[PDB]
Amino acid sequence: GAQVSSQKVGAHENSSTINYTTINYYKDSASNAASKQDYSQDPSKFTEPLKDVLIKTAPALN
């Protein structure tokens, strides 16, 4: 059940990809740590809720 992922290495030792291992010990997922591997998304639903979304080089009002 071990889960293996690559670390995003910031300061590299003078010694390439480094990994870390995770194992869940409990049946209830609420007990689990946070994966912190979070996908992002477009702001458009907030920055552009327009029915006709227009392109920035064209006149906003036409």
């Binding site: 059940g1 071990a2 889960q3 293996v4 992922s5």
Partner: peptide
């Protein structure tokens, strides 16, 4: 294992 489940290595991602």
């Amino acid at each position: 294992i489940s290595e991602v």
